[model samples]
Target chain A: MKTLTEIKQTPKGIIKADESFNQVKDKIRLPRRILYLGCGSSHFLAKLLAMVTNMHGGTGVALPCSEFLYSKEAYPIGKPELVVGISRSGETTEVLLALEKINTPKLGISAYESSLTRACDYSLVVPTIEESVVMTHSFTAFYFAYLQLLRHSYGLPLLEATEVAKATEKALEYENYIKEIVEDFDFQNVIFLGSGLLYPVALEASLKMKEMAIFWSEAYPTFEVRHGFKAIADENTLVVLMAQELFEWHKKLVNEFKGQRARVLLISNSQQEFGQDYSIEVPRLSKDATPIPYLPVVQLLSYYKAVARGLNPDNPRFLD
Target chain B: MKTLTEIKQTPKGIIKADESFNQVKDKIRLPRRILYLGCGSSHFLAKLLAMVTNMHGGTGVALPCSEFLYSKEAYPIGKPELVVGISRSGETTEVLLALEKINTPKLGISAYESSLTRACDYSLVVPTIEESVVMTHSFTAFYFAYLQLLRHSYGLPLLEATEVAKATEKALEYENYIKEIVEDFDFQNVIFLGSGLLYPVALEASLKMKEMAIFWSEAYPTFEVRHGFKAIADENTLVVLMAQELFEWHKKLVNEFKGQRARVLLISNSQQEFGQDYSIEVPRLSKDATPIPYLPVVQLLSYYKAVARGLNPDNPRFLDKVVRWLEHHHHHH
Candidate 1:
């Protein structure tokens, strides 16, 4: 029988994404206003890109393809200068319909040179395509390519690929530990919390748990959880905190969660401890690159948990 | 004990809002870009206002007060021409802090002349302040006021106040029906779905269920609900559809939910048979004014559900009337 270790390394698309970035770097231009359109995991990536662009002195908006198609009047600010469509499968109905309605300069980013390339004014084909239903490596590869595009457009420094790979390798060391924790805890509910750039990452993480493990999960901005969401938390809930910087307020929140008897998993670049139930410290990287290393560890956790629950991570049920 | 009918009529703020609108109609001006800021129920109202403004040939953005304050760079297009803050107390810490951070032409809409009046460049105070913890009448009153503001600024026709009040009074007929349904249905999970202008109303409905009844409720755009959220539905779930214009696709969605054994409740102007387990026919109004009539019925449903569960609708356990934690933390800092 093929070992789980061999099955885990099957989605190796992200390792060679730097070459894909170099190929598309000079062809793309950052516009004054950008509208990112996609669906599913790609939609989450679009939101992350929009935030990154805005943070680095540009304007970008993320709209789910269906929302853009159905409620175009909801955005009355007028047409954007550019519309970027993303689809792992280039023939997604909503993405194609939205691109047709936009009536602007269009760019398509995909893993294969398919219908999206023919549909858009310009296209970039990343080399990392996956066979699984749920996106794993493709998400990371597209994210890396887009980060490089932002770096080129805004004159920002590029995160070194080797350093990121090394950090990710270090993150994988916690696999056995996570698997053991998941088996022992038997948590029926999961909550992921982040803020600023990590907010979308938290959302993606929650979606991963939902899709792969069939678990009831939710995501919210770190502070927004206190509004009314924390009432649902108890000993059976597993709360994951994607800590960017260890603020005094964040520590207070962690203490509160602990007091509620909900198990906490803290993921961060800093080694400073807050007495969390579980902690995974990755090699320190820039804030922009933190998600790259942080995501793979959570993905692995979800994968192993699905296996423990006697489910298949490759073909998540009821998912398109 | 007060009868549910009298208790339901306690939130009579919407009836007098049109008079307040007439007083302030000529004083406000619409800007090219507008940012609406608030928290909790106010945030939901901000989203509704933003959608209404966009539909009426204007630009508007809705940001939660904390999001606006903490992640200002997320909106890098530029500063809005005007910032409108909505709070019942006129002293929510996040709203006040956001108004201070945004040093631009400001407008405050509240129930009384308070600190927000002193902070803003212009103010409009509605006379429907509530004595309860939850924002019941205040939400509807402010919504009517802003709908009027949208009418005056964009040269759009105003929804007749009498017609709105009549529709709301007609909506009150569903009181016993909603109470019986809440008692009969032992649903622990509730989902609210809406599209276009009704989307924010759906969100507010879900929040009402969460805050008042302490139920696990969520809201999503009607079509978006089919994407991945339906996986959790079962016989124990109650799905509320805030139907605007009954579409063929929407009926198909209702059938699918029924197939999953989830009880579906349709709220619409048309009494067309969709085979939902429950249906509430509201008096039809303009597309923009549909929420005014539809919301009151759902609010009554939540109130009765809270009473049925022996939970206090007047005082939700966790939330504050004016966000005391942030204020306490800020003072310490």
Candidate 2:
């Protein structure tokens, strides 16, 4: 099967992934204050989960495992009711060390059964796994597992995997278009912009570019791009706007970046045009589930850009 | 007076700057939950103060005003007892916007009487001000104002300004040393590493390099730098270590960077040598107050590097006196 097919299968894969977490749901009590910890793409997922947790009436804080592990003075006041650790391999040293130090009721979410599952008070081992070093399906699979647990526990509406699968299939159709844009642009810098839960999605997208394509990439919230960060954007820059819902300010920013002769790419569920240099419309879903479909488009772009540079997307250089 | 003397006088200047804030300390009560907000250097200072605030007993959180301003979903849970806003100009649009939206009991810290001071419920206007686009003395001055307030309210040990001034003077002596290193290295990237409160100081230092020298600079926590960021380090990189105490891992990191042919600059209060390529030892102070002496060393480096690059340090090319874009027409850029 093609890489796009593997990616498109994620939403369905996520549904299957939730079965393991649900079996252990009776053992877990959702905590009032949650601290989500991980590294890299996993860390980005933790941030998105933290926002979701808080939105569902819990106080959630996301921290990089290294930041939590090394600093003694961080999180000075209240203890977290639950510490949730995310690691695909369940073997990342920082994640393991942080889970050890937190000394709180713990939950571990991983793609496979490993040391993390054994260490935590509760564990969720999703079956959806990745063979490559670059995380593709594992991120969404684990994300969906936790998201499902949150919904099940809180009595929130369950997102339909069929809807997300349809969106991903539609997104996969644009692979040629994504590759064309990747080929057309000679970008020295790449900036990803999103807001709210989408902010961490932007961060994940930028990290994907950095990991797979080995590009100079950064991520910021949509409004934050205007605050001193836009100084770096010029003719050779590619500004990617990741929006769940297009706002007037979003269009203004697209025009602003275009005014600077920078290449602007709009990735959103909205069909309303922003006059960007390029636009990719993902199959629309609820804002909460948009990340499921939104991710594959950028992942493909990064993969194609890596191929264009004659670098292996699976084994990027400068990363072990 | 010479610029070095002016910088060296910062600690004493800070003590004098606190007179304004001290007068109003009685009117202010330390809150249980505090949300600190600002942008750029002010934001870094907010992060530092938030750490200090929490360590000293209050529950404090620091957020970039832009992040807090735009996202309604951000900070969904607890209502803050007080929102502390920091801006040197007292007019950053993000800071003002955040303060307006927070609708909490507000406190404003600035160097002059401006919109922020007028808008907040209570204001501490320090006399130490900067004419340049980049924040210098104003940062320390406002930082000291808050630090003193924390000390007074919490009964924390007070820091002596004379000790900090002496330490700063000692730091100023390294100007020629810092300039020689800046002049010698043809660096394309600068990475700053620190732990705890020093992490925010590292961020401010990196921002100085970006605003003044207009260089590619980034900051990470001491251990976090080694994770994936080390991938970019090479001969053209300068890695700065800001430490309060030297650990074994720090030496290993310095040696590792050296092995990669990247230049390493160590700034610390401790004289324990890590065999770094260059070292600047500032006056030792309470762990809480080291940031006072630590700031000038990097600020001077950024200024000199800007001069070296033939750019005016007083006016960075892209940035305005305050964030101008938020207030101006969208297409102005």
The model with the greatest DockQ is 2
| Model 1 regions more than 4 Å off | A1-12, A272-275, A304-310, B1-11, B326-333
Model 1 Cα shift for residue A223 (angstroms): 1.6
List model 2 lDDT by residue over B1-333, tens digit each: 133344555766677666875688798876767888878778888889888887777777887786786665555336778889988888887788778776688999888789899989998888775667777767777787788788877776766666766776777788899889878997888889888888888888888877777676778778766645566678888999998878898888899888878899999877776878888888888777778878888888777777788876576665667773455336565
- Candidate 2 lDDT, A1-320, residue by residue in tens: 24445565665676666676577666776776888898878888988988888777877788777667666564542678888999888888788888887678899988878888889998988877576667877787787778768777777776776666677778878888988998899787788888887788888888777677766777877876665566667898899898878767787789878877888999888886878989888887766677777788878877777777777766655555
Each model's lDDT comes to 0.76, 0.77
Chain A TM-score values, per prediction: 0.93, 0.94
Candidate 2 segments whose C-alpha is farther than 4 A from its true place: A1-13, B1-13, B324-333
Task: Please state the error at residue A149 of candidate 1 in Å.
Answer: 1.3
Please give the range of 10 consecutive residues that has the lowest summed lDDT in model 2 chain A.
A1-10
Give the C-alpha miss distance for residue B333 in model 1, angstroms: 14
As for candidate 1, its clashing pairs are none
Task: Kindly give the number of clashing pairs for every candidate.
Answer: 0, 0
